Amino acid sequence: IPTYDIYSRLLKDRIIMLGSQIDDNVANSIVSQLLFLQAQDSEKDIYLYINSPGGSVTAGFAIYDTIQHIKPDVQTICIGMAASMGSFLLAAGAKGKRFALPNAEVMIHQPLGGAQGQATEIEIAANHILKTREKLNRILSERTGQSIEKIQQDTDRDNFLTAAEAKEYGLIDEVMEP
Amino acid sequence: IPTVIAYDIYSRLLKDRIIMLGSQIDDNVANSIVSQLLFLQAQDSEKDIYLYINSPGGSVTAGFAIYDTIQHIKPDVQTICIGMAASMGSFLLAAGAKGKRFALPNAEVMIHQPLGGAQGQATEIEIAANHILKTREKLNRILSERTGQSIEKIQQDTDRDNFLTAAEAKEYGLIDEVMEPE
Amino acid sequence: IPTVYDIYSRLLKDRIIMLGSQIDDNVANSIVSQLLFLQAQDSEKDIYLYINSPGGSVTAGFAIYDTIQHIKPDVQTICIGMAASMGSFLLAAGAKGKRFALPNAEVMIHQPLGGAQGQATEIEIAANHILKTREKLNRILSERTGQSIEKIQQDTDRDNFLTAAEAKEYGLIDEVMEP
Amino acid sequence: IPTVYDIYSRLLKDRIIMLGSQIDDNVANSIVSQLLFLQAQDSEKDIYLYINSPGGSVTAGFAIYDTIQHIKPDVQTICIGMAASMGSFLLAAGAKGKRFALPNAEVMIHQPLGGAQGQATEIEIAANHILKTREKLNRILSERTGQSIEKIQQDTDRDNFLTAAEAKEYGLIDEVMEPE
Amino acid sequence: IPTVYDIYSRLLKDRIIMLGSQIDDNVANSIVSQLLFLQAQDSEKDIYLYINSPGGSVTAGFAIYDTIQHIKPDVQTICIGMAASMGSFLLAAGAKGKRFALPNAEVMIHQPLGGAQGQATEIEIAANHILKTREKLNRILSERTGQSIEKIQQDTDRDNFLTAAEAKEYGLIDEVMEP
Amino acid sequence: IPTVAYDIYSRLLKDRIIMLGSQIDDNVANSIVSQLLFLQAQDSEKDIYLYINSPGGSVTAGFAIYDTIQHIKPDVQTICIGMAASMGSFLLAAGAKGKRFALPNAEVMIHQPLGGAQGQATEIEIAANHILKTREKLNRILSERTGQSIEKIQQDTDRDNFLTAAEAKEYGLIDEVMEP
Amino acid sequence: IPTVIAYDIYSRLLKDRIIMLGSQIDDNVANSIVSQLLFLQAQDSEKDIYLYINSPGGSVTAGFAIYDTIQHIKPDVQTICIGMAASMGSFLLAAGAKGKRFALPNAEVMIHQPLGGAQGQATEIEIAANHILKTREKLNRILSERTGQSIEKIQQDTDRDNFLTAAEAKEYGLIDEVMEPE
Amino acid sequence: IPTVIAYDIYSRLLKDRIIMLGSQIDDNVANSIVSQLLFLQAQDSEKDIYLYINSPGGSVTAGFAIYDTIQHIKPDVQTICIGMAASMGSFLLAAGAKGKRFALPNAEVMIHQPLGGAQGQATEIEIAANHILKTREKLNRILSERTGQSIEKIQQDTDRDNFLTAAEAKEYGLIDEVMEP
Amino acid sequence: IPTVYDIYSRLLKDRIIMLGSQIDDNVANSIVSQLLFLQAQDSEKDIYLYINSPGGSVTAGFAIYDTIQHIKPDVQTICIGMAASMGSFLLAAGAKGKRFALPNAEVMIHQPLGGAQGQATEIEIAANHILKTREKLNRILSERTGQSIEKIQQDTDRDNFLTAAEAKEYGLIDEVMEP
Ligand SMILES: *[B]([O])([O])[C]([C][C]([C])[C])[N]C(=O)[C]([C]C1=[C][C]=[C][C]=[C]1)[N]C(=O)C1=[C]N=[C][C]=N1
Ligand SMILES: *[B]([O])([O])[C]([C][C]([C])[C])[N]C(=O)[C]([C]C1=[C][C]=[C][C]=[C]1)[N]C(=O)C1=[C]N=[C][C]=N1
Ligand SMILES: *[B]([O])([O])[C]([C][C]([C])[C])[N]C(=O)[C]([C]C1=[C][C]=[C][C]=[C]1)[N]C(=O)C1=[C]N=[C][C]=N1
Ligand SMILES: *[B]([O])([O])[C]([C][C]([C])[C])[N]C(=O)[C]([C]C1=[C][C]=[C][C]=[C]1)[N]C(=O)C1=[C]N=[C][C]=N1
Ligand SMILES: *[B]([O])([O])[C]([C][C]([C])[C])[N]C(=O)[C]([C]C1=[C][C]=[C][C]=[C]1)[N]C(=O)C1=[C]N=[C][C]=N1
Ligand SMILES: *[B]([O])([O])[C]([C][C]([C])[C])[N]C(=O)[C]([C]C1=[C][C]=[C][C]=[C]1)[N]C(=O)C1=[C]N=[C][C]=N1
Ligand SMILES: *[B]([O])([O])[C]([C][C]([C])[C])[N]C(=O)[C]([C]C1=[C][C]=[C][C]=[C]1)[N]C(=O)C1=[C]N=[C][C]=N1
Ligand SMILES: *[B]([O])([O])[C]([C][C]([C])[C])[N]C(=O)[C]([C]C1=[C][C]=[C][C]=[C]1)[N]C(=O)C1=[C]N=[C][C]=N1
Ligand SMILES: *[B]([O])([O])[C]([C][C]([C])[C])[N]C(=O)[C]([C]C1=[C][C]=[C][C]=[C]1)[N]C(=O)C1=[C]N=[C][C]=N1
């Protein structure tokens, strides 16, 4: 905001700041930043700070798949709160390089959505959101080491975790101490 | 709206065992129709009742309050479609006493599958989808019994809005006769 | 609005029905109930249906139309002011020889209007339905006026305003009621 | 709103109809029904139509106009307050010799108003219709006032306010009713 | 709202009319109908018109004004609360000698208000009409109060509030009604 | 709306029939409670028939009805038509034992209470404790009325749970499916 | 949108012949994408262009502005689905250079039939219905050519919303490869 | 929105004599397109101009500001339909230099009669009706000149919305060539 | 909007001013500022004012009109699209011999529009003002076209649409610019 703006100045040092809800506009910007940083240097780590209430699942997967596709390691650092698709992206950082600050919060839960129309249309929408949850649970299981059954049970309702609990859960690797 | 020497016009027709269904079907309408049906049975459990239907449809459970009351009471309930019987309106038309389901010649009948909505967590959406799918299975089973068509044919024919003339509704089994002028 | 009965209830006692609004399911339900009541009171005496209406729902209009044709009494139709769209269709539906308009009353005919929203498949279903509805209206209007279906189709493509004398020449009414 | 009957129903018992609002289909249907009822009660006795109206729908006004001319009784018209637009047309439609205005009542005449939207072909249809409607109104008003159609056309091009005395000079009424 | 008849209908039985609202065409239609009804019942007995009104439409007020002057009975006018604008004009229109205000009633006089929109020619027509309406009001108020038209014009250029005693001095009423 | 002078519902009340056919709020409960009290005063022994087609509503309003049913001397039969959901299914289960019915295609739905809380953490805690105690109260009564364990009721009301009339009988929410 | 040593991030990617289509498709978006394609061809008529697609779809005519420009220009336009390619977005994904249409492993693809509206006289509704049906036939024919699926199968599979994984989109022929991590 | 170095993408294309119409046509759009056409004639009075058209149409008088400017200036203005050219958009497509009017293969063209509104006194509605009818006659006369169809055929073919494929638009005379790859 | 100058800034370098909107105070102050700037750059060279405008505020238009007459350079006016109301007034205000319209440009002339609300005295003031404003516009338009004031008054009573050829015949422009 102070004028580079401050975010452009941090991007020069390979730091991307996610500090909002995740929608297609945010995801397209984050993806473009990741591809640019890879083009600048395919070896150096990238740092993705996350303070986000979540957002669109498909927008989040644009970021997730780009993180996994590019050559650089992407460190993830939770400040404030990583909720919903934000906590999914926090867990998507390079293994060994996923962090939270000591008073940061992590929240996990199941996807939300809506369906309107004919019974046949509602069935299609329900099957899609159920398949999307299975996809999220399968990946979270791979990234945390927890069973798919445990992820399913633990996301049935809003589940708030301290930074220490998120490390225990396998969502992060370390609580970043001063 | 007008008054007869004092009854409003619908109260006057109710004295002759005629019930007019001429609106969307919601709980308020169903409560009134059920009450009229129970009242008419208490007055005379043998005489026929006449239910005129001009309705775009409405709530499935409100329609089933009327449907079940029709089947519970002793009097035959004749159904007469004027104008249009759509959605739950055509379901109630088909629910009239066998042999006593009618449509006037230019009345229209429309059948289709139920509509609804669901919002919230994936598990809540799944519960709502399962509920509306089961409701459709229930409606199709009854319509099959009342029309003679197979459940599979009902399912195919209600996937989208399906408009029938009075003559087509008779051929389908939704009514027994097209009422020709007296 | 005034009391004597309200004024419309007082006229109903003399077998007069006033259709003086847009035609919707509520209006059709009331008119059909009045027609059925009058037939039950006396199945031989004429009924008088005054029409001042901009039109309205086609299915609501057909509830009235089919009830007129079903009951035993002749239903005279009398246009005052304007009978447009489904209003002019009901005007033409009165007992043959007993369809009237006052000298400065206006009659308007046109094709049905509607809407469709959604998938291409759903728009196609809605279009086929409104087109079949137009064919149904045109066939009946042809029968009631003596005009060919082809002429009715041409003459309803756009709004077509008729004077009372032109409505008689067209076959929508039988007589212009003079003082 | 007072009860005696409400006050209007009580006056209707004495063959008086009160027009005190804009003229739309609901008002016209009521007035036509009152006129038909009064003729059925007695086809010989006069009816009195009081008019305080800003005007309204032309077709609704013609429902009233044609019913006045159709029925057997003379319909006296009495302007109180203001008879504007379709209201002044109905004032002039009273039985000749029995059209009145009170001394400070106002009369306004002007041409019809309307709207049109859509394709050029549709706008043309709507324009032709309102122009034919104006010709019809002007022709009848010429017959009822004795003024030429050309003068009626000129005098209604814009809002034209008349005193009661001016309305009598114009032929819209027959007499200014002075205090009894 | 209470019932005895509702309270106002009960007062009308004793020839009392209550004007307690803004004056519009609906109110004038009711007041005029009550005046005609009372004259038809008895053309000699006085009528009592209570006035608590902020004013309203000039033509609606003149419907009432001309009916008061037309009918045979004397119409006493009694201001309670406030008689403003067309309300004070109607107060002054009561039978001479029978116009009253209660001691703390307020009277306000001012010039007409209106609006005009459109072409210059239309604005000119509207301005001429409201100016001619103001001249008519001033001429009648001059006759009713005994004040010159020139004085009425000056005293109504802006809102002019009067006590009951001042209204009597002005000629708008004849007496302040004491207990 | 029709008249028999009685409206149709007043006419049914003469035969000890009460129709609950809307959402349950304080106004509806006030009306139902008053009808129950009136019927007891007319005849303290004869059965009352309460038809239920309701999506539910306020818990405290529902308990005004519930406690009145249990307080009065007459048995209250409950008859579900259409749908008895949420507090509606609670009241259906509250009818006199042996006299709780559903029509064959009527639906029953049970779930836990819903609410909201806003303000300071202390205020949110008070509101949360209140809705949890309210849920425990509902579940304890439903367990007594159905014969199901409290643990099963809690399990079966965690989310919306739709039951057919035959399933509602098997569950213990009603005693019989009313056949034609 | 951050700035780079001065470019905004998207202008910086355009320097390397990368176009980001990351919103609903309307005339404004199509004007921008078409102008970028024309500019890139003018810079170099031989080098590939990369079109990233994360779009819920949008206007069919706006999508065809982009589609026809992709086919008209000389460079191959690679298409890469990230996140979701739905409706006209999945149609443009399938429009990339054959062999150079990609989706990331967790990207979603959705296909369905066109949506629209019609209001007015019966003859106007008929004109609008005929137009949207002809538009659907055009989309299906091109999608058949681009995927290898029959027109009949496309019609069947787009009757309702049809969600596909990246792997299923490859089997369907909408893309050529699922891009696995580098 | 993207920048080329500094030009926005549309300014960079204008440097190569390309004008992009990609919106409804209102006075603001017409002011901009007229200004670009004047500027390009000032930069070079001989070289062709390329006007891409993807437009639902819009104001007739705004469209005529563009139309008259195309005919007035010395350079040939090529018109290229991408997406859709409807209503005044198809009128402008047909207004390009003869032999240099193009549509891409899946571009749509739609022709129809003008739309408008009128409110007020009968005399004002008559003035408004006469104006829109004269405007329709003007549009039909010019479209006849530019397509080679008779005025009577243009009138009949524009009574309702009339959608054409690119190939149908060429046969009609609205364009000269379907641009193939 | 096209930018490196925007396109309008580039045309201003060549002494071209583009009027392409309604005329309000913001537009007038921009146009006046451009005219004054151009005069300061070169007081001898012509200025070109393109006009496509539905009109607007009379006083804003007179800010432009008086500036055109005040500065030394000839201001050519060129109508493209439509010059209506104050737009056609400004079109007629260009240097004599240098007022143009393109062949399919339209010109519309009519009387001023406005509004007035409040006391009768206030409506009278507003009516007198718009009437004097119309007299001022007609007198200037008479001078710039050669038509009598009486003819201008008659021809602007309602909306009067003119082709470019008719506007030349009327005297609002000097030439229809052919290709
Ligand atoms: B969360 O709350 O951020 C969650 C992500 C996940 C890891 C549990 N996101 C969602 O549940 C979103 C909510 C949303 C709906 C609509 C617009 C934007 C965001 N859901 C989806 O993206 C969704 C919904 N239905 C089907 C598929 N995806
Ligand atoms: B119809 O359109 O009348 C139809 C009845 C038919 C298929 C026999 N009714 C419905 O589909 C209604 C629509 C509706 C929704 C919400 C409020 C009122 C009406 N559906 C339901 O009643 C419904 C929806 N979801 C689940 C169960 N029931
Ligand atoms: B008219 O204008 O009254 C006309 C009747 C005439 C052609 C004999 N009615 C309609 O066109 C109505 C308009 C309408 C739309 C929506 C609500 C109410 C009225 N159309 C229909 O009733 C209709 C019927 N079937 C299909 C589509 N529209
Ligand atoms: B007046 O102002 O009441 C006037 C009557 C006068 C000329 C004898 N009436 C109208 O101009 C009405 C206005 C109106 C429009 C819409 C709803 C209600 C009233 N005009 C018409 O009735 C009309 C308009 N266009 C065509 C035909 N009739
Ligand atoms: B007053 O404020 O009541 C006043 C009356 C008079 C005795 C000075 N009335 C008006 O000025 C009204 C205001 C108004 C009320 C309701 C509708 C419209 C206007 N003015 C008019 O009645 C009127 C009369 N002729 C022209 C314009 N306005
Ligand atoms: B149900 O949905 O009818 C249910 C009743 C129960 C037996 C499962 N009712 C509620 O959950 C209501 C919802 C409501 C909220 C606000 C106003 C009206 C109704 N809840 C309560 O009444 C409630 C909520 N919080 C605390 C106490 N009571
Ligand atoms: B999709 O949902 O994006 C779809 C494209 C197709 C490949 C399945 N687009 C549409 O269905 C659009 C929806 C829309 C409507 C209105 C404005 C913008 C977008 N339809 C159309 O573009 C359309 C509608 N009717 C006729 C022709 N084209
Ligand atoms: B079209 O749909 O773009 C069409 C152009 C023509 C070639 C058939 N445009 C119009 O019909 C416009 C529509 C419009 C109305 C109002 C504001 C903006 C656009 N009509 C006019 O420009 C018009 C309307 N009435 C009179 C004169 N011109
Ligand atoms: B026209 O429509 O541009 C016209 C000018 C013509 C007669 C040469 N202008 C006006 O009539 C404007 C309309 C307007 C009203 C309100 C805001 C903006 C524009 N009228 C006036 O500027 C005006 C001037 N004096 C008094 C009242 N109105």
Side-chain angles (χ1 to χ4, degrees), chain H residues 56-61 86-89 91 112-117 128 131-132 135 139:
Chain H
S59 156
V60 173
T61 57
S87 186
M88 203 68 174
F91 188 87
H112 69 186
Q113 59 166 304
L115 297 299
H131 177 53
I132 191 168
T135 299
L139 292 160

Short mmCIF file of all heavy atoms in Angstrom, two decimals, chain H residues 56-61 86-89 91 112-117 128 131-132 135 139, ligand 8:
data_model
loop_
_atom_site.label_atom_id
_atom_site.label_comp_id
_atom_site.label_asym_id
_atom_site.label_seq_id
_atom_site.Cartn_x
_atom_site.Cartn_y
_atom_site.Cartn_z
N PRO H 56 -22.95 -5.62 -29.68
CA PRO H 56 -24.39 -5.86 -29.69
C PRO H 56 -25.18 -4.74 -30.34
O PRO H 56 -26.40 -4.89 -30.52
CB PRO H 56 -24.72 -5.98 -28.20
CG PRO H 56 -23.76 -5.05 -27.53
CD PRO H 56 -22.46 -5.20 -28.35
N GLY H 57 -24.53 -3.65 -30.72
CA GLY H 57 -25.25 -2.53 -31.31
C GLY H 57 -25.31 -1.36 -30.35
O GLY H 57 -24.46 -1.24 -29.47
N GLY H 58 -26.33 -0.53 -30.49
CA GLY H 58 -26.42 0.62 -29.60
C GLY H 58 -27.10 1.77 -30.32
O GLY H 58 -27.97 1.56 -31.16
N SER H 59 -26.67 2.98 -29.98
CA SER H 59 -27.37 4.17 -30.43
C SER H 59 -27.21 4.37 -31.93
O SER H 59 -26.09 4.29 -32.45
CB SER H 59 -26.82 5.39 -29.69
OG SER H 59 -27.05 6.55 -30.45
N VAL H 60 -28.32 4.64 -32.63
CA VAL H 60 -28.21 4.86 -34.07
C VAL H 60 -27.40 6.13 -34.38
O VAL H 60 -26.57 6.12 -35.30
CB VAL H 60 -29.61 4.90 -34.72
CG1 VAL H 60 -29.52 5.30 -36.19
CG2 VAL H 60 -30.30 3.55 -34.57
N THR H 61 -27.62 7.22 -33.65
CA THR H 61 -26.88 8.44 -34.02
C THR H 61 -25.40 8.29 -33.69
O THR H 61 -24.54 8.77 -34.44
CB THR H 61 -27.45 9.70 -33.35
OG1 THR H 61 -27.45 9.55 -31.91
CG2 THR H 61 -28.85 9.95 -33.85
N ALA H 86 -24.26 -7.16 -34.16
CA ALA H 86 -25.71 -7.12 -34.14
C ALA H 86 -26.16 -5.68 -34.21
O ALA H 86 -25.50 -4.79 -33.66
CB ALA H 86 -26.29 -7.74 -32.86
N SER H 87 -27.29 -5.47 -34.88
CA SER H 87 -27.97 -4.18 -34.85
C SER H 87 -27.00 -3.15 -35.43
O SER H 87 -26.48 -3.38 -36.54
CB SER H 87 -28.46 -3.91 -33.44
OG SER H 87 -29.22 -2.75 -33.45
N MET H 88 -26.72 -2.05 -34.73
CA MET H 88 -25.84 -1.06 -35.34
C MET H 88 -24.45 -1.62 -35.55
O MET H 88 -23.71 -1.10 -36.39
CB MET H 88 -25.82 0.21 -34.47
CG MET H 88 -25.40 1.46 -35.28
SD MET H 88 -26.69 1.92 -36.52
CE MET H 88 -26.04 3.47 -37.16
N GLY H 89 -24.09 -2.69 -34.83
CA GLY H 89 -22.81 -3.34 -35.09
C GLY H 89 -22.75 -3.98 -36.47
O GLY H 89 -21.71 -3.92 -37.16
N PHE H 91 -24.63 -2.95 -39.02
CA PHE H 91 -24.64 -1.82 -39.94
C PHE H 91 -23.23 -1.28 -40.18
O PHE H 91 -22.87 -0.96 -41.32
CB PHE H 91 -25.56 -0.73 -39.39
CG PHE H 91 -25.80 0.40 -40.32
CD1 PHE H 91 -26.81 0.34 -41.27
CD2 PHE H 91 -25.03 1.55 -40.24
CE1 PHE H 91 -27.04 1.42 -42.12
CE2 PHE H 91 -25.28 2.64 -41.05
CZ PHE H 91 -26.28 2.56 -42.01
N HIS H 112 -31.86 -6.19 -37.48
CA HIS H 112 -33.25 -5.98 -37.09
C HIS H 112 -33.57 -4.49 -37.19
O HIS H 112 -32.73 -3.67 -37.55
CB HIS H 112 -33.57 -6.57 -35.70
CG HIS H 112 -32.92 -5.87 -34.54
ND1 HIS H 112 -33.03 -6.36 -33.25
CD2 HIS H 112 -32.18 -4.75 -34.46
CE1 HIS H 112 -32.38 -5.56 -32.42
NE2 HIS H 112 -31.86 -4.57 -33.13
N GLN H 113 -34.83 -4.15 -36.91
CA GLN H 113 -35.26 -2.76 -37.03
C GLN H 113 -34.97 -1.98 -35.76
O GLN H 113 -34.77 -2.55 -34.68
CB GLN H 113 -36.76 -2.72 -37.37
CG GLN H 113 -37.67 -3.39 -36.34
CD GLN H 113 -39.13 -3.00 -36.58
OE1 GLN H 113 -39.43 -1.82 -36.62
NE2 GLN H 113 -40.01 -3.98 -36.80
N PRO H 114 -34.91 -0.65 -35.84
CA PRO H 114 -34.58 0.14 -34.65
C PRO H 114 -35.62 0.02 -33.54
O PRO H 114 -36.79 -0.27 -33.79
CB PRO H 114 -34.50 1.59 -35.16
CG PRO H 114 -34.69 1.56 -36.61
CD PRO H 114 -35.12 0.19 -37.05
N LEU H 115 -35.17 0.25 -32.31
CA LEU H 115 -35.99 0.21 -31.09
C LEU H 115 -36.00 1.59 -30.45
O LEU H 115 -35.02 2.34 -30.54
CB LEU H 115 -35.43 -0.79 -30.05
CG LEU H 115 -35.29 -2.32 -30.24
CD1 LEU H 115 -36.61 -2.98 -30.48
CD2 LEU H 115 -34.30 -2.70 -31.32
N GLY H 116 -37.07 1.91 -29.75
CA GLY H 116 -37.08 3.17 -29.05
C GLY H 116 -38.24 3.27 -28.09
O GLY H 116 -38.88 2.27 -27.75
N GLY H 117 -38.48 4.49 -27.64
CA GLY H 117 -39.60 4.73 -26.75
C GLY H 117 -40.11 6.14 -26.95
O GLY H 117 -39.46 6.99 -27.56
N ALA H 128 -42.31 11.45 -32.06
CA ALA H 128 -41.33 10.41 -31.79
C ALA H 128 -41.48 9.24 -32.77
O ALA H 128 -40.48 8.69 -33.26
CB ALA H 128 -41.47 9.92 -30.34
N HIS H 131 -40.13 10.25 -36.15
CA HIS H 131 -38.67 10.26 -36.16
C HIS H 131 -38.09 8.85 -36.28
O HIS H 131 -37.16 8.61 -37.06
CB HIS H 131 -38.16 10.96 -34.89
CG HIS H 131 -36.67 10.97 -34.76
ND1 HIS H 131 -35.85 11.44 -35.77
CD2 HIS H 131 -35.85 10.59 -33.76
CE1 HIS H 131 -34.59 11.36 -35.38
NE2 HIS H 131 -34.56 10.83 -34.17
N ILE H 132 -38.62 7.89 -35.50
CA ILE H 132 -37.98 6.57 -35.56
C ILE H 132 -38.30 5.90 -36.88
O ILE H 132 -37.45 5.16 -37.42
CB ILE H 132 -38.35 5.68 -34.35
CG1 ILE H 132 -37.44 4.43 -34.31
CG2 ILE H 132 -39.78 5.24 -34.41
CD1 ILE H 132 -37.53 3.64 -33.00
N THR H 135 -35.91 7.36 -39.33
CA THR H 135 -34.60 6.77 -39.07
C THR H 135 -34.51 5.36 -39.65
O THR H 135 -33.48 4.98 -40.22
CB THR H 135 -34.31 6.76 -37.57
OG1 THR H 135 -34.29 8.10 -37.07
CG2 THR H 135 -32.97 6.11 -37.28
N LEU H 139 -31.71 4.05 -42.43
CA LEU H 139 -30.90 2.84 -42.26
C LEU H 139 -31.13 1.82 -43.38
O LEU H 139 -30.18 1.22 -43.90
CB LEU H 139 -31.22 2.21 -40.90
CG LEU H 139 -30.79 2.96 -39.64
CD1 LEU H 139 -31.61 2.44 -38.45
CD2 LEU H 139 -29.34 2.72 -39.38
B1 LIG J 8 -29.72 -1.89 -32.40
O1 LIG J 8 -30.47 -2.75 -31.62
O2 LIG J 8 -28.46 -1.58 -32.00
C1 LIG J 8 -30.39 -0.66 -33.17
C2 LIG J 8 -29.65 -0.16 -34.42
C3 LIG J 8 -30.21 -0.30 -35.84
C4 LIG J 8 -29.17 -0.50 -36.94
C5 LIG J 8 -31.31 -1.33 -35.95
N1 LIG J 8 -30.40 0.45 -32.20
C6 LIG J 8 -31.53 1.05 -31.87
O3 LIG J 8 -32.59 0.72 -32.34
C7 LIG J 8 -31.42 2.18 -30.86
C8 LIG J 8 -31.56 1.53 -29.47
C9 LIG J 8 -31.27 2.52 -28.39
C10 LIG J 8 -32.32 3.24 -27.78
C11 LIG J 8 -32.03 4.16 -26.78
C12 LIG J 8 -30.71 4.37 -26.39
C13 LIG J 8 -29.67 3.67 -26.99
C14 LIG J 8 -29.95 2.74 -27.99
N2 LIG J 8 -32.42 3.18 -31.15
C15 LIG J 8 -32.05 4.44 -31.42
O4 LIG J 8 -30.88 4.83 -31.44
C16 LIG J 8 -33.19 5.37 -31.72
C17 LIG J 8 -34.39 5.26 -31.03
N3 LIG J 8 -35.40 6.09 -31.28
C18 LIG J 8 -35.23 7.01 -32.22
C19 LIG J 8 -34.02 7.13 -32.92
N4 LIG J 8 -33.01 6.30 -32.66
#
